[PDB]
From Swiss-Prot:
It comes from the Viruses. It is found in: Virion. The chain holds residues 523 to 543 of 591 of the full protein. The gene is gag. This is Nucleocapsid protein p14. Binds strongly to viral nucleic acids and promote their aggregation. Also destabilizes the nucleic acids duplexes via highly structured zinc-binding motifs. It comes from Mouse mammary tumor virus (strain C3H) (MMTV). A zinc finger (CCHC-type) spans 3-20. The lineage of its organism: Viruses, Riboviria, Pararnavirae, Artverviricota, Revtraviricetes.
Length: 21
């Protein structure tokens, strides 16, 4: 279990981490 991406819905990064820039 790791950071969930609330943008794509994947794992290994958070939404905020996803396309932060
Ligand atoms: Zn993502």
């Amino acid at each position: 279990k790791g950071p969930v991406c609330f943008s794509c819905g994947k794992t290994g990064h958070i939404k905020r981490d996803c396309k932060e820039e």
